[PDB]
Every structure is written in C-alpha cells, then in structure tokens.
Amino acid sequence: GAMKLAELTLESDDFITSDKLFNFCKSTGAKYVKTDFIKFRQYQYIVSNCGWRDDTDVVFLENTPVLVTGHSDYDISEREIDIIRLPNIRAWFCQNRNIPHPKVISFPLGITNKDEPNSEIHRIIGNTDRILEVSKTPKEIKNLVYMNITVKNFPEERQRIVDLYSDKSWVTIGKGEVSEEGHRKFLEDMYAHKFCFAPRGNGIDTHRLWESLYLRTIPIVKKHIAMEQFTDLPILFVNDWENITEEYLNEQYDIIMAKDWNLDKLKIDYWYQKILEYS
Ligand SMILES: CCCCCCCCO[C@@H]1O[C@@H](C)[C@@H](O)[C@@H](O[C@H]2O[C@H](C)[C@@H](O)[C@H](O)[C@@H]2O)[C@@H]1O[C@H]1O[C@H](CO)[C@H](O)[C@H](O)[C@H]1O
Ligand SMILES: [Ca+2]
Ligand SMILES: [Ca+2]
Ligand SMILES: [Mg+2]
Ligand SMILES: [Mg+2]
Ligand SMILES: [Mg+2]
Ligand SMILES: [Mg+2]
Ligand SMILES: [Mg+2]
C-alpha cells in the first residue's frame, strides 16, 4: 500500500506488538519462541518457552517451517547460524536481525506489550489507545526534532546525541514522567515534531522508532543491518550522529514527505500475512 506518510490512517488493532505475533502463532507451521530461549538453549535444535506466557510446548526446530522470535533485545547473529542452516526452516521472522542471511526476516519491534504480567510500565507505555488518540488530533508542529532518550540504554550513541543536539533551538528535550499522563504528554509532544531521535538502545530496534512512525513523526536512526529491511519506511537513516543541521533535516523532511512508503508494514496484518505466506 504505497502512500505518503501524511496519509497514514490507523485502527486500534493495527499496532504491531510481539505479543500479537505470539497469539497468532499459538492460535492459528509457525512457532513463536522468546529469543532468550534461542540464545540460551540447552539443546541444538530443541527449544521451549518453559512456561513463559504459559507455553510449555517443546519446539523441534528440525520440524518447524517458520520460526518467530521476539520479546527481547537479544539479536539473531552467527550464534544461531546452525539453526538458520536447517533446510526445513523456510523463514525466521525475528526482532533485531543481526546477520546478513536471506532466510532471516526482520519484523518491527512495534509497541510495548500492555499485558505483560505485573508490570505497570508495560501497562502504561504499552497503551496503544493513547497512540491512536494522539494520531487523530491535528498535527501542529511545535519544533523540528524531539529528544527523549535514556542515555544508559546505549551510551555510545545516545550520549553523543545529547552532547551535540540538546543545546539546539530546533531540538526539544522531553521530560521523563512514567505515568498514564506523562505518557500522553510524551506522545503529544513527539506528535508535535517533524522528526524524533530514535537511536538504538539495549537492543538495536527500539520502541521509539515505531511510536514515532505511528504518529507520523519521522524517526532518525543510525544505519544498521537490523534496519536494512525497513528502508521502504519513512525513516531517516544516518551514517553517524554528526553534522545533523536544521538545513539537513529540512531537506530530508521535504524528500521524505514527497515519497511513497510501504506504510502497510506498520500494520499487524502485513506480518500476519507474511507469516501465513511462508508457513
Ligand atoms: C529500570 C529498569 C530497566 C530494565 C532492567 C532490565 C535490563 C534488561 O532489559 C532489556 O533492556 C532494557 C533496556 C529494555 O529494553 C527491556 O525491555 C523490556 O522492558 C521494556 C520496558 C519494554 O518496553 C520492552 O518491550 C521489554 O519488555 C529489555 O528486556 C528485554 O530484553 C532482554 C534482553 O536484553 C530480555 O530478553 C528481557 O526478558 C526482555 O524483556
Ligand atoms: Ca511520504
Ligand atoms: Ca555526517
Ligand atoms: Mg504528517
Ligand atoms: Mg552487524
Ligand atoms: Mg539487539
Ligand atoms: Mg535487517
Ligand atoms: Mg508528492
């Protein structure tokens, strides 16, 4: 569905969450395994969720046509090549793809899972109803870029951004308030900017990336193989966090605003479809 970012319309159930992919695999030739159980597996081709999300099923990776991994900042890298090499696995949909292999397909981190057991932060920032609400209000641009990052999730890049662009007039620093109201302001604030700093965190993919896109705010991300399959989305990819200027962003805004984008990727259906196609 090639269309311009400004034309992004959203429904309540369109937001991508790794949970939605779990239930779609548990209910409806596709196994969802928390990446942690793939990373710290005791057997080579046998894994399981060990009760996580009430899933005691044993997975025989030698017999699964499609494997889905997520709910984690862990990446898929050479450590999992022996699984990727399995001939019966036709597709590996994963969060944080960190290997140049055509069998591995990235899917968006999306939005936090509100239904995480006994976690208010998840119940707060996992609230897609708020994101949907703000996306319906008039997008009155208050400033160019929006900065609200926890530097301690990936200091190497994040600290560099703050050291450089916090003092810029065309940048707004967002306050840190973990609450239903603090979240709403955080969404309304990011909604009111053309861009938003979306650097990688503990994991390569970040929720800020997709919160920004659902609000039609262009996220700024550093180039990474894990993002090499999202270049058909209105994301501003940068070689480094240096020499970003109001002119450069004003240039990329007009370009990114004039282009057509595969915005259907932002919808859960695109990934339901892709999992059904391969399975
Ligand atoms: C003040 C407390 C800070 C956190 C302390 C714990 C450090 C590890 O926490 C990891 O790094 C953080 C910077 C977050 O990204 C965190 O994310 C989770 O919580 C967010 C609020 C949600 O938004 C996300 O969806 C996701 O549930 C992420 O945890 C996931 O990845 C891990 C591998 O790294 C494990 O697989 C774990 O099981 C997963 O949940
Ligand atoms: Ca566009
Ligand atoms: Ca540069
Ligand atoms: Mg717009
Ligand atoms: Mg790499
Ligand atoms: Mg990662
Ligand atoms: Mg990739
Ligand atoms: Mg045009």
Q: Output the six-digit token pair for 32.
A: 């969802």
Which letter does DSSP use for residue 76 in this model? B
Q: Give which of 136, 112, 135, 111 is closest to 216, Cα–Cα.
A: 135
Strand 91-94 with 171-173, pairing: unpaired
Q: Output the six-digit token pair for 225.
A: 């193989």
How far is 241 from 199, CA to CA, in rounded Å? 9
How far is 108 from 266, CA to CA, in rounded Å? 8
Reported as type and span, the H/E element at residue 20 is helix 18-26
**CA quadruple 62, 74, 217, 17: dihedral sign:** positive
User: In the chain, which residues are followed by a C-to-N distance beyond 2.5 Å, i.e. a gap?
Assistant: 28
Q: Output the six-digit token pair for 237.
A: 């990819």
Give Cα separations from 252 to 138, 213, 216, 234, 255 (angstroms): 22, 15, 14, 10, 5
Best residue among 69, 73, 116 to mutate for probing ligand 1's pocket (most ligand atoms within 8 Å of CB) is 73
> For residue 34, which atom of ligand 1 is closest to its CA?
36
Taking CA atoms only, the protein residue closest to ligand 1 atom 29 is 72
Experimental technique for the deposited model: X-ray
Distance, C-alpha 252 to centroid of its chain: 21
Q: Is 188 in the pocket of ligand 1 (CB under 6 A)?
A: no
Give the count of beta carbons closer than 10 Å to the beta carbon of residue 279.
Answer: 18
Helix axes 207-214, 180-191, angle to 10 degrees: 60
- What are the structural domains, with CATH classification, of the chain? 2-16+114-267 (3.40.50), 18-107 (no CATH)
How far is 236 from 105, CA to CA, in rounded Å? 21
Q: What is the DSSP string of 137-191?
A: S-----BSEEE---GGGSHHHHHHHHHHHTT-TTEEEPP---SHHHHHHHHHHHH
64 and 90 Cβ atoms separated by less than 8 Å:
no
User: Is 224 exposed, middle or buried (CB count within 10 Å of its CB: 0-12, 13-18, 19+)?
Assistant: middle
What is the whole-number distance in angstroms between the Cα of residue 241 and the centre of ligand 3?
Answer: 7
